[PDB]
Structures are given as C-alpha cells and as structure tokens.
Amino acid sequence: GLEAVRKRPGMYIGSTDSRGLHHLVYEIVDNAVDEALSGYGNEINVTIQKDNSICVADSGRGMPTGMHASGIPTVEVIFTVLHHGVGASVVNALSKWLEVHIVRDGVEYMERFEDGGKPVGTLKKIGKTKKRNGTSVTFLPDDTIFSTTNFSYEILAERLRESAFLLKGVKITLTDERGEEPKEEVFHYEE
Numbered sequence: 001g002l003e004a005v006r007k008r009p010g011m012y013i014g015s016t017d018s019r020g021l022h023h024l025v026y027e028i029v030d031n032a033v034d035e036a037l038s039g040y041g042n043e044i045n046v047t048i049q050k051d052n053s054i055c056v057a058d059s060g061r062g063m064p065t066g067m068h069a070s071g072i073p074t075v076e077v078i079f080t081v082l083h084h085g086v087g088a089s090v091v092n093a094l095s096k097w098l099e100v101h102i103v104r105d106g107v108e109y110m111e112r113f114e115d116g117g118k119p120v121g122t123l124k125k126i127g128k129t130k131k132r133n134g135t136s137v138t139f140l141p142d143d144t145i146f147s148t149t150n151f152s153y154e155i156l157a158e159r160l161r162e163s164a165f166l167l168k169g170v171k172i173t174l175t176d177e178r179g180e181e182p183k184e185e186v187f188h189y190e191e
C-alpha cells in the first residue's frame with residue numbers, strides 16, 4: 001500500500017532531505033517526458049507555486065479517464081496503487097494533497113487526493129473546455145515526512161535542462177512565483 005511508502009520513503013525515493021524533495025518533481029516530470037517521447041506533447045511546464053507546491057503540466061493525450069479492470073478509474077489506480085505512471089503514487093503517498101487535472105477531447109476532468117493519497121470523493125468530469133489535451137499535476141510535499149520542503153530553483157533548473165537534452169521539439173519551462181515577480185528559465189532543442 002501507500003503506507004509502506006510513508007513508513008520507509010527511503011526505499012522509494014532514496015532519502016527525505018533536499019535530494020528526496022526534488023526527486024518528487026522529477027518523478028512527475030518523467031511521466032510527462034515518457035508521454036512526449038511516445039507522441040504527444042510539445043511542452044512541459046514546471047511551476048513552483050507561492051505555497052511551495054509544485055505544478056507539472058504537459059500537452060499530452062491526457063491521463064485515461066476510463067474504468068480500470070480492477071473496478072476503479074485508471075486515474076486512481078495510477079495515483080493509489082504501486083504496483084504508464086511509475087512514481088506517481090509514490091509522490092501521492094508523500095504529499096499532503098495532490099490533484100490531477102486532465103483535458104481529453106473537449107471535456108476537462110479532475111481528482112483530488114489528501115493525507116498521503118486518500119481520494120477526496122472520486123474522479124469528476126468538470127465540464128467542456130476549449131483547452132488543449134493535457135495532464136497537470138499539482139502537489140504539496142508532506143512536511144511531516146521531509147526534513148525540508150523548500151525547493152531550490154537552481155537545482156530544478158539544472159535538472160530540467162538535462163531532461164530537455166532528451167527531447168526534440170518539446171520545450172521545458174521552470175517558473176518560480178514565490179517570488180514577487182515570475183522568475184523563469186526555458187530549455188528547448190532543436191533537431
């Protein structure tokens with residue numbers, strides 16, 4: 001279960017200091033680049049929000065909104081079961097809250113999780129939008145778990161540039177809004 005992650009997060013993300021904190025960002029990001037390398041998205045946006053929560057947003061197909069063979073939505077399986085989206089449930093387990101916003105085929109979806117991965121209600125259709133297809137994940141890391149919940153902008157920029165090195169024609173932006181004015185870096189290549 002997700003309790004195993006909270007009991008021994010070191011066996012899942014290496015440590016719960018600054019290193020482990022930033023690792024949470026990379027887990028969600030890698031799912032976006034997986035999608036980019038599959039298809040399927042010309043930009044990945046990473047935003048450090050004012051409340052020290054992280055948003056990771058892509059322009060991919062959008063996380064599947066249908067029922068999983070186990071009898072709960074595929075969105076929920078990805079974020080609540082370990083054992084597509086490796087690391088997503090780990091991030092969910094170690095966050096105070098997390099929500100996923102999905103836009104698929106002109107309809108927008110959302111689901112919220114709290115207290116280490118407990119679903120708040122269920123997956124919901126919000127209503128039709130003109131927005132492009134994509135998945136957006138916001139989460140606030142659990143401060144009772146991490147030694148520090150204070151994201152380094154420099155560390156994120158260096159590692160996202162590295163993730164951009166992997167990619168052709170997809171643009172990775174980092175935004176810090178903590179932060180009286182929106183500070184940001186952009187990386188894109190090329191061939």
Ligand SMILES: CCc1[nH]c2nc(Sc3cccnc3)nc(OC)c2c1C=O
Pocket residue numbers: 027028029031032035056057058060061062063064078084085088135136137
């Ligand atoms: C914003 C980060 C993110 N973005 C994502 N986009 C897709 S899109 C997709 C992938 C496979 C099958 N169908 C849709 N799927 C995902 O999980 C499987 C994610 C995902 C998971 O964290």
